[PDB]
Each structure stands twice: as C-alpha cells, then as structure tokens.
Specification:
The structure is cut from a larger assembly and holds 7 copies of chain A (156 residues).
Chain A lengths: L4 H30 L3 H27 L18 H28 L3 H31 L1 H6 L5
The complex binds protoporphyrin IX containing FE (HEM) (4 copies), ligand KTG (7 copies) and fe (ii) ion.
One ligand KTG sits at the interface of chains A and G.
Chain lengths: 156, 156, 156, 156, 156, 156, 156
C-alpha cells in the first residue's frame, strides 16, 4: 500500500532510535552482568528485547507502506561507565526518543495515517514506561544510597 | 429497624474518619509505588482496602438503622512528604480514629445497641492492628536506619 | 516525567468526577441492597468499583507526571430518593463526566500528551458503557412498568 | 452440473428472501439488545444466523447448477418500531417466504430436481418452525400482557 | 445517547461499505470453493465473517447514538470472473473502504466522538490487513505463476 | 412386503449401475495407486466403497419387497487410461446413473412407494456430490495445468 | 581476566561481522514475509536470531577479557532486490565471515587463548551450516526452477 513519503521518513527516524537503544541497552545489560549486578543485567536485557520488538513492527509497517527500512545507519550509543551514568544515558536516549515519537504522531495524524499513529502511540506507551523505570531507579539511588541500591540488584 | 439517633451520629462520625483514611492511605500507597517502594505501596494499598471494607459495614449498619450515611463530608487528609512523615501522618489519624471508636462504643453500650457495639469493637481491633504496624515501622527506621528501611521496601 | 500543567489540571478534574461517582454509586448500591433490590445493588456496586479503578489509574498518571493528585476536594453527591431518581442522578453525573473527559482529551492532543489521551479515551469508553446501561434501565421502566422493573431486580 | 434455468431462478428468489430476512432479523436483534430486551435480541440473532446458513446452502447449490447467485438485489426490509410490530413484521416476511418455497418445490418436482427439492424442503421446515415461534410470541403477548411479555425477555 | 447527526451518516456509509464487502467476499468464497480452490475459498469466507463482525459493531454503535442503521441500501458488488479479477475487485473495494474510514475518523475527531473514532480505527486496521493480504496474493501470482498460485490454493 | 413389480425393476436397474461403478472406481483407484498418484487412489477407493454401500441398501430393499436382486448382469465398465480420461469416464457413468435415478423416482412417486423414493433420493444426493467432485477435478486440471494437478495428487 | 589485545581485536572484528548479519538477515526475513514467502521469511528470521546469539557470546567474552565490545560501528549491509540476489548476498557475507573466523582462531591458538578459540570454532560450525543451507537453496533454484522454488516457500 503506497504510504505517505514523510510518514515513512518518520518511521525510519523512530526505527533509527530503536536501533541505537537495542545496542545501548544490550551492552549495558552485559556490562551489568559482567559486574555481577544480575538483576540490572536481566532487566536491561528485557529492555533491549522490547526495543527489538518495536524495531520489528516498524520494519514491517515500512515495508507494507512500500518504503525501505533503514537498518544501515546507526547513531551514537550513549554508554555509561558506572551504574548511575548508564541509567542516565538510557534516560537521555528515551527523552530524545519520545520527542521524535510525538513529532511522528503529529505528522501521521495530519496525513490521516491512523494505523501508523496507533503503532507509534503503543511504542510511546512503552517508552514512557521505560522513563518511569529509569526515573524511579535514579530516585531510589538517592533514597537508599548507591551501595544498597547496587546490593539490591546483585541477585536476579 | 429504627436506631438510636446518637448511635447513628456516632456511626457517621466513624464513617467520616474511615473515609479520610481510605483516601490518605490510597494516596500514600500510590506515592510509594511511584517512588519504587513497592512493598510499602502494596501494604498501604491493603490498609486502604481494609478501611473501605469498614466503611461499607458502617454504611450498611446506618441504613439498616434507618439513618442516612454521610459520604459527602470529607475531613482533612494528612499527607506526608517522605516515608517517615507519611507513616507518622497515618499514625496520627489512627489515634484520632481509636479515640472516636471508644466514645462510640460507650454510647452504644448505654443505649443497649449491642450489635453496633460489636461492629465497632471489630473495627477497633483492626485499627489497633494498624497502630501496631505503624509503631513497628517507625521503630524499625530507628533500628536499621532509613536507607536500609527503604531498601527493604523496594521489592514485594 | 514533567507533565503539562493544564493536562494535570484536567486529570485532577476527571479524578474529582470519579471520586464523586465512587461515593454516589456506592451509596446507591447499598440503598438498593437495603431495600431488597439486590440485582440493582450488585450492578451499582460494580459501577462504583469500576470508578475506583479509573481513579487509581488517574492518580498513578498524575504522580508519574509529577503533579499532586487531589483526593481532598469532593464535589456534590447526586443522591436519589427512589429507583427512578437514583438512575437519573447517575445519568446526570455521567453526562457531566463525559463532557469533562472530552475537553481533557482535546487538551492532551494539543500538547501531544498522547498517552494521557489514550488513558482518558479508555475511561470514556467505560463511561459511555455506563450511560448505555442507565438509558436502557430508564427505558425499560417505561416498557415493562416500574413494578415489573423492580420485581426483575430483586434477585441476583 | 447444468441445472434447469427456472429452478435456478426459483433458488435465486428464495435466496433473495433469505437475504432480506438476514438483515431484518439482525437489525431487529440489535434493536432489542439496545432496548435491554436481551432474550429477544439473542433469539432474533440466532434467527438471523439460521437464515445466513440457508443462504449459504442456496448459493452453493446455485453454483453447482452453474447459475449465478444474486446477492446484489435486496428487497424491502419490514422493520417494526416496537416489539409487537417487529414480531408481526417477521411473521409477514415468513409467510411470504413459505409461499415462495412451496412454489419452488413444485417446480423442482416437475423437472425432477429432487436434490434441490430436498434442500428447499429442509429450509421450509426451518421457516415453519420460525412461524410457530412468532405466532406463539404474539399469542403470549395476549395471554400474559405486553408488560409481562417484555419483562420476561429482559434477561438471558 | 444522542450522537452527532453527521457521525451517524458517516457510520452508515462505512456500514454500507461493509455490507457490500460481506456479500462480495461471501460470493467470491463460494465461487472458489465451487472451483476446488478451497484454500482461497476458506480465507475469503473468513474475510466475509470479519466484515460481518465489523457491520455488527457499527449497527450497535449507530443504535446507541440513537440513529437508524441502514441495512436497506446495498451498493454495487464487484464480482470477478477469475481469481486474478476477484482479488483485484476485493482490493478496489478495500481502497474505497479505507478512504471512507479516514474521512469518518476526521469527523469523529472534530465533534469529539472519540469512542466512534476508536472503533473506526480498529476497523481500519482490519481493512489494511486485508489490503496487505490482497496485494501479497497479487504479487505472488507474478512471482510463482498463475498455475502454481492456484495449485497452492487447492487444498486447505 | 409385496412391492410393485416395475419399482423392483427400477431398483435392479439402479443396482446394476452401482455394480458397474463399484468395479470401475475400484480399478481406477488401484491404477492411480500403482502410478504413484496416491491421493487420487485413496479418494477413488472411497467412492467405490460408497457405491458398495448403496448397492447393499438396494439389495436389502429389493429383498424386503420380495424381489430378486440381480448381481449377475454386469454392464460395461468405462475404464480410462490416463487421469483426465478416468475422471471423464466416472463423470459419464454418473450422468447415466442420475438419469436412471430420476426416472426410478418418478415411478416410485406414481405408485406411492415413498420409502423406495426416499432411498433413491439419498443415493441421488450422493451421486450429485460425486459429480460435483468430478466436475471440480476436471476444472482444476484446466486451471492449474495437468502436471501440477497430478503433482498435487501424489501424496496423501 | 586480562585478555590478549590482538585476540580482543579479532573478537570485535567477528562481532562486527555478526552485527552486519543480524540486520541483513532480519531485513531479508521481513522482505520475504512482506512478499508472502513466509517459509523463507521464518527461516531467515531464525538465521538472524542465531547471529544475535553469537553476538551475545562475543560481547560476553570481550567483557570478561576486559575489552570494550564494539556495537557502534556497523559495516555495509548486502541487501538483495529479489530472492536469488538476497540468498547470494547472504552467501557472500558468510564467506567473508568464515575467512575472518579462521584468521581469529589462528591467532587465539598462537597466544594459547584456547577458550576463545573454542567459542570461535562453535560459531564457525554455525556459519558453515548457514553456508550449506544457502548453497543448497541456490542449487534447488536451478533444479526445480525459480517459480517452483518460490512456490515451495509461500507457506510455513
Ligand atoms: C535490527 C536489530 C535487531 C532486531 C530487529 C532484533 C529482533 C529480535 C527479535 C524480534 C527477537 C525475538 C524477541 C522475542 O519475541 O522474544 C530477538 C531476540 C534476541 N535478540 Fe535481537 N534484534 C536485533 C538486534 C540484536 C542485537 C544487536 C543483539 C545482541 C548483541 C540481539 C540479541 C538478541 C537475543 C540474545 C535474543 C534472544 C534470542 C533467544 O534466545 O531466543 N538482538 N531479537
Ligand atoms: C466511599 C468510599 C469507598 C468505598 C466504600 C470503597 C469500597 C470498596 C470495596 C468494598 C472494595 C472491595 C474490597 C474487597 O472486598 O476486596 C473496594 C475495592 C477497591 N477500591 Fe474502593 N472504596 C472507596 C473508595 C475508593 C477510592 C477513593 C479508591 C481509589 C482512589 C478506591 C480504590 C479501590 C480499588 C483499586 C479497589 C480494588 C478493585 C479491584 O481491582 O477489584 N476505593 N472498594
Ligand atoms: C449474504 C449475506 C450473509 C451470509 C451468506 C452470511 C453467512 C454467514 C455464515 C455462514 C455464518 C456462520 C454461522 C455459523 O455457522 O455459526 C455467519 C456468521 C455471522 N454473521 Fe453472517 N452472513 C451474511 C450477512 C450478515 C450480515 C449482513 C451481518 C450483520 C449485519 C452478519 C453477521 C454475522 C455474525 C455476527 C456472525 C457470527 C460471527 C462470529 O462467529 O462471531 N452476517 N454469517
Ligand atoms: C456386490 C458388489 C459389492 C458389494 C455389495 C460390496 C459391499 C461392501 C461393503 C458393504 C463394505 C463395507 C463398507 C463399510 O461399511 O466400510 C465393503 C468393503 C470393501 N469392499 Fe466391497 N462390495 C462389493 C464389491 C467389491 C469389489 C468388487 C471389491 C474389490 C475388487 C471390493 C473391495 C472392498 C474392500 C477392499 C473393502 C474394505 C474391506 C475392509 O478392509 O474392511 N468390494 N464392500
Ligand atoms: O452523603 C449522603 N448520604 C445521604 O443519605 C445523602 C442524601 N440523601 C438523600 C435521601 C436518600 C434516601 C432516601 C430514602 C431512604 O430510605 C434512604 C436514603 C443526599 C445527599 C447526600 C447524601
Ligand atoms: O489530596 C491531596 N493530594 C495531594 O497530593 C495532597 C497533599 N500533598 C502534599 C505533598 C505530597 C507529595 C510530596 C512529594 C511528592 O514527590 C509527591 C507528593 C497534601 C494534602 C492533601 C493532598
Ligand atoms: O450478485 C451477483 N451474482 C453474480 O454472479 C454477479 C456477477 N457475476 C459476474 C460473473 C462471475 C462468474 C464467472 C464465472 C463463474 O463460473 C461464476 C461466476 C456480477 C455482479 C453481481 C453478481
Ligand atoms: O435499514 C433500515 N434501518 C432502519 O432503521 C429501517 C427502518 N426503521 C424503522 C424505525 C425503527 C426504530 C424505531 C424505534 C427505535 O428506537 C429505533 C428504530 C425502516 C426500514 C428500513 C430500515
Ligand atoms: O444375481 C442374482 N440375484 C438372484 O436373486 C439370483 C438367483 N435367484 C435364485 C433364487 C434365490 C432366492 C430364493 C428365495 C428368496 O426368498 C430370495 C431369493 C439365481 C441366480 C442369480 C441371481
Ligand atoms: O560500542 C561501544 N562499546 C563500548 O564499550 C563503548 C563505549 N565504552 C564506554 C566505556 C564503558 C565501560 C566502563 C567500564 C568497564 O569496566 C567496561 C566498560 C563508548 C561508546 C561506544 C561503545
Ligand atoms: O538498510 C537498508 N534497508 C534497505 O531497504 C536497504 C537496501 N535496499 C535495496 C532494495 C531492497 C528492496 C528491493 C525490492 C523491494 O520491493 C523492497 C526492497 C540496500 C542497502 C541497505 C538497506
Ligand atoms: Fe543493606
């Protein structure tokens, strides 16, 4: 089905953000596992998987709309060097992701691609849940202290 | 069955206390969940549900006694700004609630409304159990320190 | 995640309508039960529980958006004196509620809070279902007569 | 298999009657559901389904006989404005349907299309059963009163 | 509940489209079955059933909004004479359907009938899925040859 | 029970046709199996068995009516030497069979042997189902090509 | 455990190859699904998953050896425009992958990193199995013809 050219550009921009997030979360997960913080490693693994699923749906929608999904261009991974930085890196990425999602939804609504809008809204719900998780973790570090916070994430 | 007018006023006063507690504990619960202190959130949710069940019984008794249950007047919520304050606000409310229950039981006894007394004794038992929980948490904070206490209430 | 201040105002306005509905429906339920109209009492109980669940989700959303959920202000309960009046009082409340829901969705859309919009849309679907129920009950009173209508709501 | 051209015309006439009945009974069903007369709505739904199944079998037979099933022409729906009228409308349609079934069977017998006759006979058995149901409902309205009759059809 | 007059007109237009599709898909299904292409026949039968379910929901929504669902007016069925034509006929119908759905969604959004919009969005998702299927089948005919394509659709 | 002599002659004529078909279909089945076309072989085996069952019922009816079932005279088998010809031979035999069935039914009707007619109508329904199958297979050979049609009938 | 710097460089080069393969196979998979070639799509999906699992093990090994896994640099994807090209693009990539694996194993052996060698050997066995699959599909295209080959990959 011949999609709107600018919808497809937006879907490819969101896809680009998801591909960054896949790799950043996967690397953060395996860093945390290497460090023995297995609960963080597993949670971050599931965040990466969830972004893989979003990327899949975007790829599928783009192809249906007769566009070319862009899996070649990979933007800048934000990799932290300790737990606090890694969480804040994930949050910085998520805040750019939701900004782009909102702009993509505006455009889909304007050209009446209501099915693309619905897909993007579901992804935005998932990204807002991730922002909640991240904000909560950074707040817990302040409330229980870093040493306790890390302790609570050793065992899965 | 036509009840004693002052009994009914007492029941509506206890009902008003329970209505404050429902909302205060529900809000405290959801604040704790938002902060990632999910064990406190869950426990405080169950406290709110328990007050809802008490309010239901009081409403049912007032209507049986041919009074009008007052669900319109809502007194002042005592909302804390951190875990310690929130627990102490709950305890302050409970000590007012138990005082009012004792005075209501006295009057039920005097006019021989023994069934209303038994209902209020059962509610009083639940409220004393809540006082026990609250005093215990405040003591644990002193014993284990706030950071550990909060750590212990992150996970259900 | 810092929400739009006027969105939060609207969410608190919706929450306030839900808090009225919780108490109005609960009281109506318990009145119908006291009168032996247990099918109406049970259905109205489930309507109250549904509004409790909506209020919960609104509280959770307001807190996520870093606002303060208002559980203190309780608007006017519309309590009926017989079955026809109680149903019409519920319907009057619901119509006010959907009006406020629609105006809140308009503003969510305008500021691109698409997740808040989706939550309100879901609540609106539940409120329209309640309107359907109420309009149907009122029409059935006219079709079968009040005595038959009440007969048919004695037993669960 | 090359069918008799006039058998096929008869089968298309019967199909045309079933297509009217499908839509008429489906609309009547959904009206009764909307009004809260859910027992009527469910029964009328099953009548519409039963007509759908007859139409399928007729379509299949026409194609086997190398005719063209006519799903394009839709005759006049007989829609009531209240329960008594809707039942009479169904009965009026059913009396027309059995008249046409009888004439189609006559012709099948004359040209020795005994298998089409057997199909039409089965449909006629179903349509007479619907007449029995309809005559019975109209008779019950007289015996129990319209208000009682409607009351008995509120709940499934 | 009193719905918007033009919303109801849009909903009747969509319903009118679904009524055409039900009959077109059902006939195409039974033609394919008659020809021994039973996998196409079965798939097309499920397409017709899906349209029936959409029509049901539209009728229910129109009646709730106090409109009259129009099951009398049946537009032009697009019937093919071979498999390629039948698939293209279905696709031509679906493209008219999605244009009308998008225009209906615009109007629901403008009068704030967000529940009707959500229903139409769900139907639109189903229609785009059908378009995907149709475009894919037409493409497969080119990639594998017509004879192979039909061979692969003989057996369910 | 003393049957009509000409009915019994008609029943023996139908029996004779069934006896031809048993052997023709059984040989065709075993030819197809020998050629590796096992799906045709299995389907044709089941056609032969069904004919065996009809012959059994005809034998039983003739004896009940105090006639002598003729199993001695075997008419001409129509044996094909390739798939398309075998199917055509089965179809040719079936078209002779249904012509005889219709004339037999006419006579049963005339002399009021309604039970014999019902038996013959059932047999006729089975033979028209075989005609449907055969016409469909011949149609498929044209639509998918002989080589594909055969390919699709190698395996069960 | 401090690893050999040149081993880690080899592991990151293999990881780079796996990352190209993840995205190339995933895009090819979803292209094939879009075209209705679901068997190819599912198989290619499983190939992508397998490369993801290899990349995971490489990331984990690099981190254990105190290196930095490179998920930032994504090499050139080889995307085909039809089935034949897509298979050949996969084969061209795999043949570069096995050349790099062999050179990395040589270096692991020389520096006595026998565990990294064993990992790479296991990955090589997987890549040789992928080469077998690809060479086999290309051979089948010649043996059965492209139309049949694609037909055989329509359905799962
Ligand atoms: C375009 C990029 C990618 C896409 C679209 C993608 C997609 C997927 C999908 C759809 C799944 C299955 C999820 C499920 O249903 O449970 C999955 C699983 C997985 N992915 Fe990815 N992925 C990508 C990149 C990666 C990368 C770069 C890695 C590792 C460095 C990776 C590691 C994994 C792992 C370990 C699994 C679990 C497989 C299993 O054990 O079953 N993925 N991926
Ligand atoms: C007049 C005030 C209220 C009354 C009398 C009341 C009563 C009840 C009762 C009897 C139950 C069922 C408990 C059980 O047996 O498990 C219940 C459940 C519940 N209530 Fe309330 N309630 C009130 C106010 C509220 C408020 C203000 C909220 C939230 C803001 C709320 C949220 C809930 C929730 C979430 C549930 C559980 C529902 C479920 O998932 O099953 N209630 N309430
Ligand atoms: C040519 C006209 C139609 C034909 C031949 C037809 C045929 C059928 C058939 C064969 C079934 C399956 C019944 C069973 O065995 O359970 C069915 C189901 C159904 N039909 Fe129709 N139908 C037609 C029109 C309609 C219309 C106009 C509507 C609604 C306005 C409708 C609504 C339904 C529904 C709701 C179902 C059941 C779906 C489910 O399984 O949930 N049909 N139809
Ligand atoms: C007078 C002619 C025949 C009659 C009335 C007849 C009747 C029957 C009947 C009633 C059955 C049981 C069917 C069932 O209920 O499943 C049967 C089975 C069978 N018939 Fe015949 N048959 C006749 C001739 C033949 C011939 C000529 C052959 C082969 C050359 C044959 C081969 C078979 C086979 C293989 C079975 C399956 C037996 C088993 O494995 O259980 N029949 N027949
Ligand atoms: O919070 C409230 N509790 C109440 O009862 C109430 C109202 N009552 C109207 C009379 C309801 C009534 C009538 C007959 C009967 O037998 C029992 C009760 C009105 C506004 C607010 C409230
Ligand atoms: O009904 C009410 N809703 C409220 O939020 C409230 C009050 N809030 C004090 C601050 C509560 C707070 C503080 C920090 C935070 O991160 C989130 C929340 C006080 C009285 C009555 C109400
Ligand atoms: O309602 C309708 N029934 C029909 O058959 C039809 C049309 N037929 C085109 C020929 C379709 C055809 C071709 C070959 C075949 O073997 C069987 C059928 C066209 C418009 C509307 C209708
Ligand atoms: O296709 C059609 N849809 C319709 O509604 C209709 C007719 N309506 C009669 C009024 C039916 C009515 C009455 C009261 C009510 O509360 C809701 C509905 C008449 C002919 C054909 C059609
Ligand atoms: O193929 C044949 N069918 C027959 O019936 C038959 C013969 N009949 C002898 C009498 C068999 C009989 C006797 C008494 C009775 O109550 C019923 C039947 C002889 C040769 C060939 C055939
Ligand atoms: O793709 C990438 N892989 C990486 O490692 C990386 C970066 N490294 C930050 C250091 C992260 C680190 C710190 C301590 C430690 O013990 C292990 C690792 C930065 C940008 C991109 C990439
Ligand atoms: O990252 C990438 N996404 C792509 O689509 C792509 C390339 N496409 C070649 C055409 C692929 C194609 C051809 C026909 C068709 O109907 C649909 C798609 C090439 C390099 C990198 C990328
Ligand atoms: Fe600790």
């Amino acid at each position: 089905m011949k999609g709107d050219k600018k919808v497809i550009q937006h879907l490819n921009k969101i896809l680009g953000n998801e591909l960054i997030a896949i790799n950043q979360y996967f690397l953060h997960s395996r860093m945390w596992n290497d460090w023995g913080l297995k609960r963080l490693g597993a949670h971050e693994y599931h965040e990466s998987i969830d972004e893989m699923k979003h990327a899949d749906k975007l790829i599928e929608r783009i192809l249906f709309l007769e566009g070319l999904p862009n899996l070649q261009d990979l933007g800048k991974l934000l990799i932290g060097e300790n737990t606090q930085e890694m969480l804040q890196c994930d949050l910085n990425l998520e805040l750019k992701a939701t900004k782009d999602l909102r702009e993509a939804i505006v455009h889909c609504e304007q050209v009446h691609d209501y099915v693309s809008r619905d897909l993007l809204k579901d992804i935005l719900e998932s990204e807002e849940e991730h922002i909640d998780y991240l904000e909560t973790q950074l707040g817990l570090i302040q409330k229980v202290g870093l040493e306790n916070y890390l302790q609570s994430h050793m065992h899965e």
